[PDB]
Structures are given as C-alpha cells and as structure tokens.
Amino acid sequence: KPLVGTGIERNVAVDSGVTAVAKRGGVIQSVDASRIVVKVNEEELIPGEAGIDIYNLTKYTRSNQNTCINQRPCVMPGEPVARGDVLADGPSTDLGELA
Amino acid sequence: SIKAMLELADLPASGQLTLFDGRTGDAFERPVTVGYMYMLKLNHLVDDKM
Amino acid sequence: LTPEEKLLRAIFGEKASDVKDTSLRVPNSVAGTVIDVQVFTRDGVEKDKR
Amino acid sequence: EREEAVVWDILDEVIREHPVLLNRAPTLHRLGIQAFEPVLIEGKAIQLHP
Amino acid sequence: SVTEFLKPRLVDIEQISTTHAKVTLEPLERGFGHTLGNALRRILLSSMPGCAVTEVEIEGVLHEYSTKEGVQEDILEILLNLKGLAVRVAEGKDEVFITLNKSGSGPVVAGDITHDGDVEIVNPEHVICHLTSDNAAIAMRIKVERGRGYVPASARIHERPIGRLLVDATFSPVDKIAYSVEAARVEQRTDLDKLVIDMETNGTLEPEEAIRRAATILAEQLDAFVDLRDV
Amino acid sequence: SVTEFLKPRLVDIEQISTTHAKVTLEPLERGFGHTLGNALRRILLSSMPGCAVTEVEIEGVLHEYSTKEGVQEDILEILLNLKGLAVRVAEGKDEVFITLNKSGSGPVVAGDITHDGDVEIVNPEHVICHLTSDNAAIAMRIKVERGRGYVPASARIIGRLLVDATFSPVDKIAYSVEAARVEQRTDLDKLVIDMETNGTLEPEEAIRRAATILAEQLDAFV
Amino acid sequence: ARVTVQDAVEKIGNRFDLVLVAARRARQMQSGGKDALVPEENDKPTVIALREIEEGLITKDVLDARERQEQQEQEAAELAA
Amino acid sequence: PSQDVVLGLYYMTREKINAKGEGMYLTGPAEAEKAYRTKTAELHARVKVR
C-alpha cells in the first residue's frame, strides 16, 4: 500500500475489475490459492438455489504488455464477508487498495 | 498537521535527520530530509532496450 | 554443394540433410521457466502424444 | 557463443585503444556525435561522463 | 606514554533479545573509537558468514509459478517466506537437508521442520504457509548452505531435475549495526573512550564471535600494509 | 570457504621523491578499499606519534600580536615558519629545549639552531624569518615535545607563544578507490594512496607504522 | 597509451593531414612488415603512428621519400634479376 | 560543470563568520586539507594561507 495516498485507491481497485468482489454476502466456506467458495447468507438466497458462490482466481496469466496477472486471496476460512467486499487482490492491489 | 504527526512519532518537526556517511562515519555538515516516498517501476526496462 | 564440401562428405561420410532444423528457440538474453504449453491441431490431423 | 573467459580477455584486448562513437538523437550540432574509449562494465546501460 | 597505546578489551554483551545485542569495547584512545567502529560496521555489514536456504523441493510442484491444493499461498510466496528462515548449522557441515511435513488445517511454522540435530531453528514462530483444508498436506525438502554475501539463483554456476526450485540466498546474518562512542571512566585519565556496538541480526550469529571474525578480517587485510613491499 | 578473503597481490610503490610516494594495492574485496584508506588516513593524521615545535620564547616579545623591530616577518609568520620544522628527538626524551641566536642581515635558517645532540633537524634550509637591519638581533628559545597527531594552539588554550604542533610526520594523504577485476569478478577494489611526509620518515615506513598500530589495537579480539 | 592529440597537430599543423599520415604509417605497420620506430608498449598501430609523429620521426616527407626509395630499389633489383 | 559540481564548488568556497578554526595560519593547501580532515577547522573558516 502507499503510506501517503488520496483515498481514491479503493475506488480504482474495485471498479477496475482486477479484484474478486463478493456478489452476495455470507461466510467464506473454502479458500485456496486458486478458488474461493462462499456460503451465502440466509437473507440473500434466490428460492431453489444451491446457496454457494464460487470464485475461480486468475493465476499467472499473460497480459497485453507481457506482464503477470495474478489474483491472491485476502480472506481466511470462516471469515464473514458482505456484498462488495474484496475476496482476492488482483495485480497491483493490497487489501482492496491500489498499490 | 504533518508537524503534529511528526511530533507524535518522536521525530524532528522539520523532517530532517542527522545522517552519517557509511564510507567514513563522518556526519554530514547539514541535516538531510529523510522520509518515505512511494516509488514505481516503469515499463521501460534496459533488458528490452539494449 | 561446393567441391570442398563434397570432399569433406567423401572423407567423413556424414550426410543427413533430408530435413532442415527450423525449431522454436528461446530468444537471446532471456532466461525463464516454461509454465504453460498449448497445442492446437487442425481437424483431421493426427494428435501427437503431448 | 559459449562466452568463455579467454573470449572476455580477447575482447578486452580488442577494445583497448579502439575508439567508439556515441550519438544522441536529435543531432542538432556536431557535438551530438563524439568519440570515446570504451571501458567494459557489468550491466546493460551505457555509462556517460557528466 | 605517547608512543604506546591502550589496547581495547571486550567488556560486556547485553543480549536485549535473540535478534538484538550490544557489545562494549573499552578502553579506546582519542579518535580510535570512531575508526574501529566504522571499520567494524563496514566489515560486519558486508563480509560475515551465515547459513541460508538455497534449494527447495516440494512434492507435486514443477515450478514456482503454480499453486498447490489446500495451500492459500502460492509457491513463490512460500519461497519468499523460506528466505527469512534463520538456520544455524553446526561447524564442519556446509550442506544440510531439512524436511517439512504437515497435514491438517493451520499455519505451517519453522518449528515443524525435522532436523538431524546439527541444525538449529532460531525463529520457530516464522510462518511459511497456511493450510486451509483438513485434507491439505505439504511435504518439502529444503537445502541449507553455508556462505557469505548475496548469491542470486542466476549467478550460481550451472543436470537439474524439474521440481528443484532455486531460492535467492542472503547468507549475511547481520541486518543493522549502529555504533556509539561515549566517555569512559578509567583510572584518573579523561581521554580514554568507549565503543558500544548495537547489532540487530537474525539470531544465527553470536555477538562476541562476530566481533572476533570482523577483527580477524581487518587484521588479515592489514597484514599487507604491515609488510609493505613491491610484489 | 567462507573465511577466505582476497589479499593484495599486486603492490606497487612509486617514489616521486624522498618524501612523496604512491602506493597501489590490488585487488581488494568490495568496500575494503574505503575502510582501509579511511582507517589509515585517520591514524596517520591524528594518531601517529612524532616530535614537533610547540612553544617559543622571543626576547622583547610578549603577546603574539606584538611587533618586533628588525624582523620583516611578523610574530605569527615566525610561528608559522616554526611549525614547518621537521625535528627528530632521540628515544627516551619527551621534552627538549633548543635555542637560536642570530644578529645581522639576511634570512635565518634552521641550520643556525644549536641543540644538545639529541635533536636532528631534517631540513636545515628551512627559513624561520628575515633580519632587515644590521643592528637587529633575534634570540629564540624553542620547546619540542613528543605527541600524537595535529593539535593546534587553540586546543591548548609569562610571555610564551604557542605554535601549532604537527607531531604527525604525514603532511598529506589522499586515497583514491578504483575498480579492479580478477577473472570475471569485476567488482573488486584497488586502493591508491598518494602520501607526502615532512622528511622525518619515508612514506612506506609511516604507512607500515600506521598499519602496525591498527593491527595491535585489535589484538584482544583476533 | 596516449590521449589528447595535441603534440601531433603541433608537429603537423593540420589535423586532416596528420590523420592521413598516421593512417599510412599504421597501414604500413599493420598490413606490411614495417616495424615501429618507438617502443610499442602494447599499443595499437594508430597510437604508435601518432607517437612517432609526435616524436618527429614520421612526416609526409619521410613516408613519400622512403616509398620512392622502395620503388627505385625494386626497379634496380628487377633489372638485376 | 553544472548542478552537483557547481554546488559543491560553491559550498566549499563560501565564507562563514566565526567558524571553527578562524584566524589560523596555514603553511599551504596541504595543511588546510590536514586541518579539515582532523576536524580542526571548517571549510568556511577565514584563515591566512601561504
């Protein structure tokens, strides 16, 4: 993270799409370097749905400028998450802040 | 506000510290602005330009 | 073949030039690890073991 | 191609008194191209006198 | 008198922590404290031996740019964490192999490494990776080498089986050195002076022994001047 | 091995004069050139033992700012000239008095100083002052001690005037650290010391004594 | 080794004429079997020619003179045959 | 010269009032350097030099 910033880094990191943002809130069921499985909360279930959310992370993918695109998890097993929370930090991102 | 922050961290209010030359051990004649700056590595690498 | 090349081939009977080596080689001053290989084969062409 | 040490010694002997031309674009005046004596350095960037 | 100096002696080690210590040299004449302090700081910060991780072999891993099921961290992050492993190797051995085997959810720390008694781990609480599943299992073979300075993986002279991951090694155990030269009360004179050297290390190398190796290096390089002649 | 370090293999000593030398040592490990050069410079400039003029008595002169008739140079210039007087004192003596008496016209040199045989003047041709009038006479009582380094008159603050004491025989030391290479290791260090002494000792001997002092200072740890 | 081609231009007068004379001398010492008139001191032919010009041993006059001398000698030798 | 060289030559050739070593008499540039390295006199001390 930048020690001195402007507060806009979160907006850029979230809106760029490089990070994995939770679509629905809940509790993280499983975390692995390439996969996040989230147990959706009881209040946000579509009737007749599985009740889980799966986020497959991009690992070491070539970019247009021959750089590395890598998504690293920033959540642990059992951590509550709400909608819009950052689950995995993409390239040049630290805990949802542009880095 | 910056000066108050520096005083909280027990640092000089001017942001300048007394530094010593590592090659001789002699203190520089004037205080030097020492701090932390956010530096970037641009996509202009000598490997791709040599 | 030039006459000297013919004499060299006659002296040492090594002559294997049915096919020419045009292989994919790593660019110079580039050192790295192979992390992915993708093979695309046309429909109707035998797929190699890889 | 194999970069042996004797090759490095040969290169050092070659460029001993061999001038080399340094040019920066744009060459507005004739001072933009000059002759220097090369000194081998470990790196990929040309070292220039201030 | 004037032509005879007072030889400094080692008088105190203050071990504030396992990675921080203070060593006091006394007595030192005028000007000699600064000279000795700067020389010892430059020698200690650059030219002292140590033990570092050089090669890692993880089962089921072909390259660093990959992931292992059940492990939150990538292999590159695991290697970076292993770079900070403080290992003390008994004398006479320049090459040791230590294994790390673990199954079950939880952090994997340096205290979980099996060693043959000739290797001591100074920071057992150092975190290497996290296992996020009960079925997750990790099995690594780590190579510890004795060396001096910074030897990157590329600079190592070149068969190597696929799976052996090369790790940049920073063999120097000394991290920070700060020297302060203060007044010392000796007999009746007020000109003698005292050197205090604060050493922040990884805990692998003792303070007194480090000072002795630094002094040995300084004297051994000074021997050329002591015997100045055309060579 | 981890305890094996590069030692100087090419040592070149080039003597411009009997008091001026250039010593080149190559190769040295990275960063050792600055360490050795700075340590030797500090010891040679502020810690070498030697003998020098410290205190001077001149008849009829009370303060350093006083004016004396018959001497073209002022008192401070006389003290400055007396600072650059290379003097050797026999071992076992830490304080010796010499005297200089001269009446006439012309330059008075260091060869006119009468000593007790335990004092050797390296440069008899050094000028102390100049006498202008034939009726002018100068009487001086010079004190020489044995000390270390360069102690000025201000640091030591009847009719006694103090002279800056240049005990160390070294007059100028400058060290340059350049790059040297063995095999493909291009990061090694080469140390060049340009040194000028006052004539008391040859530059090589002074470097040897400084190195000996530094080495003996570390005996308790090696 | 040498730097700062001053003495050579003082002895010659014109930098271009000096360059031509030094080039001829260097070609003689490199392609031909001619030997240097000064200690080589591990120097390239251009540097040796420049040093010779600085010492005054080599000028255009000398080069042309000895070249005409070699033509005369070779003509006489071919007559001798 | 420009930038750092000019700044250094300016700083070394400046004059300061009541500096350490003021009024001292020096035999020449060598003794001035010796005084500077021994911390006897500052770079900006007014002295008389032969």
XYZ file of C-alpha atoms in Angstrom, chain C residues 33 35, chain E residues 63 65:
4
model
C 10.684 -21.202 -16.688
C 4.798 -22.521 -17.221
C 7.725 -24.549 -10.855
C 4.557 -20.037 -10.714
